C-alpha cells in the first residue's frame, strides 16, 4: 500500500496524511421454421 | 454475484437480486432517475430483478510518515466491511490496519465522520476526535471573577499578498 | 494524434492529412493553455481577497488600535508590527490577556440614604463585610464614594440591591 | 460549507469499457489535476466549518439551575430529552431544510452534526455564563442581568435603564424568541439562502449525469455498440470524440465547483467574522450584527450553515 | 453592478441556417447550463444594486 | 552559434556546445526534466 502511494506522488517519501491512491473495484465473474415439411 | 448479464440485449455488469417493483405486463425493464437500467424482466420466467453495480470506491492510505514508520492503514471509502489484521467500520468506510482506541485524543489524521487516526508510539490507532476539555463555569447570580494580573502575548499571523 | 512531436508529423506525412494532426495538437494545447489561465484567474481572485484582508489589517492593526474582537490577534489588542515576507506579510500582534482571576460577591447597586447608587465605571465587589468599586478587567479596589457612584432612584425597584455606606468626600473637611 | 464530492475519472469517461481505460492513459495529468482540485475543495470545506465553529477553546457547560435573571433561553439551549442534544429552534432548522452513482461519490464531513451542535452549545454556555470574557482570555463569570447592564453601557445607555426596567426587558426578550420560531415556521423559503446551495450542487451533479447521455457528434453515446459494430480504425477515432467530450464536461464541472467554493469560502469567512464580533463580543459596527444598536448574538447550527440570532435595541 | 447580458444559442452557434439548428439538438444540455448561468448573473446584478 | 541541426532525422534548432555530462556507452540521447532534449550524440562521429 505505501509503495503505491510513493509511485503516485512521484516521490520516495510520504509525509503524514491520508492520500487517495487508487480505486477498489470488485470484479465480474419458439416458432420453429418449417424445414421439416420440405426436407 | 457480480455477473456479466444479457437479457434480450441490455448487456451489462452487476449483481441480480429479487425485487418488489410492480412492472406493467407490457414493460420489460425499468430505468432510474438518471436513466440507469435498475430492473429487468427475464424473458423465460417473467421475474423482476433489480440490478446493482459491483462494489467500488476509493482507497486511501493513512501513513504516519515515512521517516517515522513504514506501517500503513487502508481506508476503503463507502465500502462495507462485509466485503474486501484489524477491521473496523466507519461512516467513511472500511478501515483496515488500525486498532480502534476508545480514548479520545485531538485529531492528527482526519479519517472522517468524527473519526481520526494517529501513530500511537508502535501501531496506528483510530479514535473519536475530542472537541476540547469540559470546563463548566461557576455561574451564580451574585458572584463575579476579576483578573488580578495580566500577560502580554505576541501572536504571529502570516498572510499571502 | 499520431505523435506529440511536430517533426515526425511534418516529415512522415504530406500536408493534406498532416493538417488534421496539426489542428488536433493545436486544439489540445490551446485547451490546456486556456485551462491554465482560467485556473490562474481563480487563484488571483483568491490572492486579491487575501491582499485586501492584509491591507485592512495594516490599516486597522498597525496604524491604529482595533476593537474588533478577534481581528488583530486573540486577546485585547494593544498594537501590531509588520514584517516583510517573500510573497506576503507577517503581523506580530501584541495583545493583553487577563490572568490570575479571583472570585468576589457583587451587587448591581448600593442602597444608601434611601436611594440607589450605581458605579460610574467598574463593578461593586466584596471580600466579606467590605464593598469596593473596581475597574472591570483588573482588580484594583477603591472605597465607595460619591465621586465614583451615580444615584438614580429609590432602592426598592432594583432586584438584588444591597445596602452599604457611601462615603461623602465633602463631609469630613467641611465638617 | 458545500458537499464534499469526488469523481472516479475512469468510470465516468469509460465505465465497464476496458479499451476506454487503455486509451485514457494517453492524456496523463488531466485526471490528476481534477482529483487534486476536488480534494482541495473538500479540505477547504472542512477548514471552513473548523474556522466558523471551533473558535472556542474549552467545552463550556451551563449550570443545572437555569435561572438567568428572568431571561428564558430554553429555545436555544439544548434539550436532553431528545436523541440529538440540539435546541428546540435548531431542531426546527434541521427539519425545515430537506437534504455510489456511476463514479460520483459524496465524502462525509469530518465534524458530525452532534459535534457542531456541541460546539454551538459551548458557545452558548460561555456567552451566557461569562459574557464576552471567554473569547479574550480566561472565562470570567458574571451574573446575566450584569452582562446586560454592560451591554447597555456599550450602546450608550446608562446602567439603571436596565435595572429599573429589568422585568419588562426580560419579557420583551422572551417574547421575541418565541416569535422567532413562529417566523421560521411561517415562511418556508426563509432558509432558502441555505437551501439554494444544496439545490445548486444537485443541479450541477444532475447536469453531469445528463452529459453522460450526449453523443458529442458520435453515432451513439453507448461504448458497447461503438466497440461491437465498428472496426478499430473508426471505433477508436469515434471513442476519441466520446473521451474528449466527457473530459470537457468534467473539466467544466470542476471549474464551476471551484468558483462556487470560492463563493462559499467568502461566506464562511463572513460567518467566522460574525462569530468573532457579534457572538464573542459587542459590535459598535453599525449594521454588522442586525438592525438597531447591537446588544448580543446567539449561534445555531444548520445543515450546511449557521444561524445568528441578533438581539438588538430599538 | 455590471451589464446584464442574455445570449441566444441558435443565432450565435448556428445563425439563420435551418439545417445546422437541426444538427445542434444532439449536444444536449449545454445551452440550458449557459442560459441558467447568465440569468443567475443578471439576478445577482439586480441584487447588488 | 544558433544553428539548425539534423541528426539522422532528429531535427531541431539551437546552440550546440561541448557537452560536460557523462553519457554511458549505451546512451544516445539526453533528457532534462519535463523531457527536454538537453544533449545529443552525432550518429556519424559519436560526439556528445
Ligand atoms: C523526517 O523526514 C522528513 C522528510 O522525509 C522531514 O520532513 C522531517 O523533518 C524528518 N524528521 C526527523 C525527526 O528526522
Ligand atoms: C454492512 O454489512 C453489515 C454486515 O455485518 C450489515 O449488517 C449492514 O446492514 C451493511 N450495511 C448496509 C448499509 O447495508
Ligand atoms: C471501548 O469503547 C467502545 C465504544 O464503542 C466499546 O465498544 C469497547 O467495549 C470499549 N472497550 C473497553 C476495553 O472499555
Ligand atoms: C471560584 O469559585 C468556583 C466555584 O466555587 C471555583 O470552582 C473556582 O475555582 C473559584 N476560582 C478561584 C480563583 O478561586
Ligand atoms: C477585605 O479587604 C479589606 C481591604 O483589602 C480588608 O481591610 C478586610 O480585612 C478584608 N476582609 C476580609 C474578610 O478579608
Ligand atoms: C439567586 O437565585 C436564587 C435561586 O435561583 C435565589 O434564591 C436568590 O434570591 C437569587 N439572588 C439574587 C441576588 O438574585
Ligand atoms: C421558557 O419558554 C418555554 C416556551 O414558551 C416555556 O415552556 C418555558 O416554561 C419557559 N421556561 C421557564 C423556565 O419558564
JSON list of C-alpha atoms in Angstrom, two decimals, chain C residues 54-172:
[
{"chain": "C", "resi": 54, "resn": "UNK", "atom": "CA", "xyz": [-3.82, 42.22, 4.64]},
{"chain": "C", "resi": 55, "resn": "UNK", "atom": "CA", "xyz": [-4.29, 45.87, 3.65]},
{"chain": "C", "resi": 56, "resn": "UNK", "atom": "CA", "xyz": [-7.22, 46.18, 6.05]},
{"chain": "C", "resi": 57, "resn": "UNK", "atom": "CA", "xyz": [-5.09, 44.56, 8.77]},
{"chain": "C", "resi": 58, "resn": "UNK", "atom": "CA", "xyz": [-2.27, 47.03, 8.14]},
{"chain": "C", "resi": 59, "resn": "UNK", "atom": "CA", "xyz": [-4.73, 49.93, 8.27]},
{"chain": "C", "resi": 60, "resn": "UNK", "atom": "CA", "xyz": [-6.61, 48.86, 11.39]},
{"chain": "C", "resi": 61, "resn": "UNK", "atom": "CA", "xyz": [-3.94, 46.94, 13.35]},
{"chain": "C", "resi": 62, "resn": "UNK", "atom": "CA", "xyz": [-0.70, 48.78, 12.54]},
{"chain": "C", "resi": 63, "resn": "UNK", "atom": "CA", "xyz": [-1.98, 52.33, 12.05]},
{"chain": "C", "resi": 64, "resn": "UNK", "atom": "CA", "xyz": [-4.45, 52.12, 14.94]},
{"chain": "C", "resi": 65, "resn": "UNK", "atom": "CA", "xyz": [-5.88, 50.06, 17.77]},
{"chain": "C", "resi": 66, "resn": "UNK", "atom": "CA", "xyz": [-8.71, 47.73, 16.79]},
{"chain": "C", "resi": 67, "resn": "UNK", "atom": "CA", "xyz": [-11.86, 46.99, 18.80]},
{"chain": "C", "resi": 68, "resn": "UNK", "atom": "CA", "xyz": [-12.95, 44.11, 16.57]},
{"chain": "C", "resi": 69, "resn": "UNK", "atom": "CA", "xyz": [-12.94, 41.11, 18.83]},
{"chain": "C", "resi": 70, "resn": "UNK", "atom": "CA", "xyz": [-10.52, 38.69, 17.10]},
{"chain": "C", "resi": 71, "resn": "UNK", "atom": "CA", "xyz": [-9.27, 40.77, 14.19]},
{"chain": "C", "resi": 72, "resn": "UNK", "atom": "CA", "xyz": [-5.82, 41.84, 15.37]},
{"chain": "C", "resi": 73, "resn": "UNK", "atom": "CA", "xyz": [-4.96, 38.64, 17.22]},
{"chain": "C", "resi": 74, "resn": "UNK", "atom": "CA", "xyz": [-6.50, 36.83, 20.17]},
{"chain": "C", "resi": 75, "resn": "UNK", "atom": "CA", "xyz": [-6.89, 38.98, 23.27]},
{"chain": "C", "resi": 76, "resn": "UNK", "atom": "CA", "xyz": [-7.42, 42.68, 23.84]},
{"chain": "C", "resi": 77, "resn": "UNK", "atom": "CA", "xyz": [-5.42, 44.33, 21.07]},
{"chain": "C", "resi": 78, "resn": "UNK", "atom": "CA", "xyz": [-2.55, 46.59, 22.10]},
{"chain": "C", "resi": 79, "resn": "UNK", "atom": "CA", "xyz": [-0.59, 47.06, 18.85]},
{"chain": "C", "resi": 80, "resn": "UNK", "atom": "CA", "xyz": [0.84, 45.27, 15.83]},
{"chain": "C", "resi": 81, "resn": "UNK", "atom": "CA", "xyz": [4.07, 45.21, 13.84]},
{"chain": "C", "resi": 82, "resn": "UNK", "atom": "CA", "xyz": [4.56, 44.38, 10.14]},
{"chain": "C", "resi": 83, "resn": "UNK", "atom": "CA", "xyz": [7.33, 42.18, 8.82]},
{"chain": "C", "resi": 84, "resn": "UNK", "atom": "CA", "xyz": [8.10, 41.54, 5.18]},
{"chain": "C", "resi": 85, "resn": "UNK", "atom": "CA", "xyz": [7.94, 38.01, 3.77]},
{"chain": "C", "resi": 86, "resn": "UNK", "atom": "CA", "xyz": [8.71, 36.58, 0.30]},
{"chain": "C", "resi": 87, "resn": "UNK", "atom": "CA", "xyz": [5.18, 36.80, -1.16]},
{"chain": "C", "resi": 88, "resn": "UNK", "atom": "CA", "xyz": [3.28, 38.04, 1.86]},
{"chain": "C", "resi": 89, "resn": "UNK", "atom": "CA", "xyz": [3.36, 39.80, 5.19]},
{"chain": "C", "resi": 90, "resn": "UNK", "atom": "CA", "xyz": [3.65, 38.76, 8.84]},
{"chain": "C", "resi": 91, "resn": "UNK", "atom": "CA", "xyz": [1.85, 40.63, 11.61]},
{"chain": "C", "resi": 92, "resn": "UNK", "atom": "CA", "xyz": [3.14, 40.50, 15.19]},
{"chain": "C", "resi": 93, "resn": "UNK", "atom": "CA", "xyz": [0.03, 41.20, 17.24]},
{"chain": "C", "resi": 94, "resn": "UNK", "atom": "CA", "xyz": [0.76, 42.44, 20.76]},
{"chain": "C", "resi": 95, "resn": "UNK", "atom": "CA", "xyz": [-2.31, 41.83, 22.92]},
{"chain": "C", "resi": 96, "resn": "UNK", "atom": "CA", "xyz": [-3.30, 41.94, 26.59]},
{"chain": "C", "resi": 97, "resn": "UNK", "atom": "CA", "xyz": [-4.51, 38.74, 28.26]},
{"chain": "C", "resi": 98, "resn": "UNK", "atom": "CA", "xyz": [-6.12, 38.78, 31.73]},
{"chain": "C", "resi": 99, "resn": "UNK", "atom": "CA", "xyz": [-4.71, 36.28, 34.23]},
{"chain": "C", "resi": 100, "resn": "UNK", "atom": "CA", "xyz": [-4.99, 35.12, 37.85]},
{"chain": "C", "resi": 101, "resn": "UNK", "atom": "CA", "xyz": [-8.70, 35.73, 38.31]},
{"chain": "C", "resi": 102, "resn": "UNK", "atom": "CA", "xyz": [-10.35, 35.69, 41.73]},
{"chain": "C", "resi": 103, "resn": "UNK", "atom": "CA", "xyz": [-13.92, 35.22, 42.96]},
{"chain": "C", "resi": 104, "resn": "UNK", "atom": "CA", "xyz": [-15.96, 38.00, 44.54]},
{"chain": "C", "resi": 105, "resn": "UNK", "atom": "CA", "xyz": [-19.52, 38.87, 45.51]},
{"chain": "C", "resi": 106, "resn": "UNK", "atom": "CA", "xyz": [-21.33, 41.57, 43.53]},
{"chain": "C", "resi": 107, "resn": "UNK", "atom": "CA", "xyz": [-24.47, 43.68, 43.77]},
{"chain": "C", "resi": 108, "resn": "UNK", "atom": "CA", "xyz": [-25.91, 45.75, 40.90]},
{"chain": "C", "resi": 109, "resn": "UNK", "atom": "CA", "xyz": [-26.46, 48.79, 43.14]},
{"chain": "C", "resi": 110, "resn": "UNK", "atom": "CA", "xyz": [-25.89, 50.12, 46.66]},
{"chain": "C", "resi": 111, "resn": "UNK", "atom": "CA", "xyz": [-28.86, 51.39, 48.68]},
{"chain": "C", "resi": 112, "resn": "UNK", "atom": "CA", "xyz": [-27.61, 54.35, 50.71]},
{"chain": "C", "resi": 113, "resn": "UNK", "atom": "CA", "xyz": [-29.75, 57.02, 52.39]},
{"chain": "C", "resi": 114, "resn": "UNK", "atom": "CA", "xyz": [-32.82, 55.52, 50.74]},
{"chain": "C", "resi": 115, "resn": "UNK", "atom": "CA", "xyz": [-31.53, 55.83, 47.17]},
{"chain": "C", "resi": 116, "resn": "UNK", "atom": "CA", "xyz": [-29.72, 53.51, 44.78]},
{"chain": "C", "resi": 117, "resn": "UNK", "atom": "CA", "xyz": [-26.13, 54.03, 43.63]},
{"chain": "C", "resi": 118, "resn": "UNK", "atom": "CA", "xyz": [-24.65, 52.56, 40.50]},
{"chain": "C", "resi": 119, "resn": "UNK", "atom": "CA", "xyz": [-20.86, 52.74, 39.65]},
{"chain": "C", "resi": 120, "resn": "UNK", "atom": "CA", "xyz": [-19.81, 55.25, 37.02]},
{"chain": "C", "resi": 121, "resn": "UNK", "atom": "CA", "xyz": [-17.18, 52.83, 35.76]},
{"chain": "C", "resi": 122, "resn": "UNK", "atom": "CA", "xyz": [-16.41, 49.47, 37.28]},
{"chain": "C", "resi": 123, "resn": "UNK", "atom": "CA", "xyz": [-18.30, 46.99, 39.42]},
{"chain": "C", "resi": 124, "resn": "UNK", "atom": "CA", "xyz": [-19.11, 46.60, 43.10]},
{"chain": "C", "resi": 125, "resn": "UNK", "atom": "CA", "xyz": [-17.20, 43.68, 44.62]},
{"chain": "C", "resi": 126, "resn": "UNK", "atom": "CA", "xyz": [-16.90, 42.29, 48.13]},
{"chain": "C", "resi": 127, "resn": "UNK", "atom": "CA", "xyz": [-14.45, 40.21, 50.15]},
{"chain": "C", "resi": 128, "resn": "UNK", "atom": "CA", "xyz": [-16.79, 39.78, 53.12]},
{"chain": "C", "resi": 129, "resn": "UNK", "atom": "CA", "xyz": [-18.32, 42.69, 55.07]},
{"chain": "C", "resi": 130, "resn": "UNK", "atom": "CA", "xyz": [-16.40, 45.11, 52.82]},
{"chain": "C", "resi": 131, "resn": "UNK", "atom": "CA", "xyz": [-17.52, 46.56, 49.49]},
{"chain": "C", "resi": 132, "resn": "UNK", "atom": "CA", "xyz": [-15.34, 48.23, 46.86]},
{"chain": "C", "resi": 133, "resn": "UNK", "atom": "CA", "xyz": [-15.64, 49.79, 43.42]},
{"chain": "C", "resi": 134, "resn": "UNK", "atom": "CA", "xyz": [-13.17, 48.28, 40.98]},
{"chain": "C", "resi": 135, "resn": "UNK", "atom": "CA", "xyz": [-12.46, 48.56, 37.29]},
{"chain": "C", "resi": 136, "resn": "UNK", "atom": "CA", "xyz": [-13.94, 45.83, 35.13]},
{"chain": "C", "resi": 137, "resn": "UNK", "atom": "CA", "xyz": [-10.90, 43.85, 33.94]},
{"chain": "C", "resi": 138, "resn": "UNK", "atom": "CA", "xyz": [-8.21, 44.42, 36.58]},
{"chain": "C", "resi": 139, "resn": "UNK", "atom": "CA", "xyz": [-8.61, 44.00, 40.32]},
{"chain": "C", "resi": 140, "resn": "UNK", "atom": "CA", "xyz": [-7.96, 47.41, 41.90]},
{"chain": "C", "resi": 141, "resn": "UNK", "atom": "CA", "xyz": [-10.45, 48.03, 44.72]},
{"chain": "C", "resi": 142, "resn": "UNK", "atom": "CA", "xyz": [-11.33, 51.54, 45.84]},
{"chain": "C", "resi": 143, "resn": "UNK", "atom": "CA", "xyz": [-13.58, 52.72, 48.65]},
{"chain": "C", "resi": 144, "resn": "UNK", "atom": "CA", "xyz": [-17.15, 53.51, 47.57]},
{"chain": "C", "resi": 145, "resn": "UNK", "atom": "CA", "xyz": [-17.68, 57.28, 47.47]},
{"chain": "C", "resi": 146, "resn": "UNK", "atom": "CA", "xyz": [-19.89, 59.70, 45.57]},
{"chain": "C", "resi": 147, "resn": "UNK", "atom": "CA", "xyz": [-17.11, 60.51, 43.10]},
{"chain": "C", "resi": 148, "resn": "UNK", "atom": "CA", "xyz": [-17.30, 57.04, 41.51]},
{"chain": "C", "resi": 149, "resn": "UNK", "atom": "CA", "xyz": [-21.03, 56.31, 42.12]},
{"chain": "C", "resi": 150, "resn": "UNK", "atom": "CA", "xyz": [-24.17, 57.83, 40.47]},
{"chain": "C", "resi": 151, "resn": "UNK", "atom": "CA", "xyz": [-27.57, 57.98, 42.32]},
{"chain": "C", "resi": 152, "resn": "UNK", "atom": "CA", "xyz": [-30.62, 57.05, 40.28]},
{"chain": "C", "resi": 153, "resn": "UNK", "atom": "CA", "xyz": [-33.88, 56.33, 42.10]},
{"chain": "C", "resi": 154, "resn": "UNK", "atom": "CA", "xyz": [-35.08, 54.78, 45.34]},
{"chain": "C", "resi": 155, "resn": "UNK", "atom": "CA", "xyz": [-33.65, 51.40, 46.31]},
{"chain": "C", "resi": 156, "resn": "UNK", "atom": "CA", "xyz": [-36.94, 49.47, 46.13]},
{"chain": "C", "resi": 157, "resn": "UNK", "atom": "CA", "xyz": [-37.10, 48.79, 42.37]},
{"chain": "C", "resi": 158, "resn": "UNK", "atom": "CA", "xyz": [-33.72, 47.11, 41.72]},
{"chain": "C", "resi": 159, "resn": "UNK", "atom": "CA", "xyz": [-33.57, 43.33, 42.11]},
{"chain": "C", "resi": 160, "resn": "UNK", "atom": "CA", "xyz": [-30.51, 42.33, 44.10]},
{"chain": "C", "resi": 161, "resn": "UNK", "atom": "CA", "xyz": [-29.59, 45.71, 45.58]},
{"chain": "C", "resi": 162, "resn": "UNK", "atom": "CA", "xyz": [-27.58, 45.54, 48.81]},
{"chain": "C", "resi": 163, "resn": "UNK", "atom": "CA", "xyz": [-27.27, 48.33, 51.36]},
{"chain": "C", "resi": 164, "resn": "UNK", "atom": "CA", "xyz": [-23.93, 49.82, 52.40]},
{"chain": "C", "resi": 165, "resn": "UNK", "atom": "CA", "xyz": [-22.38, 53.16, 53.29]},
{"chain": "C", "resi": 166, "resn": "UNK", "atom": "CA", "xyz": [-21.16, 55.51, 50.55]},
{"chain": "C", "resi": 167, "resn": "UNK", "atom": "CA", "xyz": [-18.57, 57.96, 51.85]},
{"chain": "C", "resi": 168, "resn": "UNK", "atom": "CA", "xyz": [-19.13, 61.64, 51.15]},
{"chain": "C", "resi": 169, "resn": "UNK", "atom": "CA", "xyz": [-15.81, 63.32, 50.24]},
{"chain": "C", "resi": 170, "resn": "UNK", "atom": "CA", "xyz": [-17.03, 66.78, 51.30]},
{"chain": "C", "resi": 171, "resn": "UNK", "atom": "CA", "xyz": [-18.31, 65.65, 54.71]},
{"chain": "C", "resi": 172, "resn": "UNK", "atom": "CA", "xyz": [-15.10, 65.43, 56.80]}
]
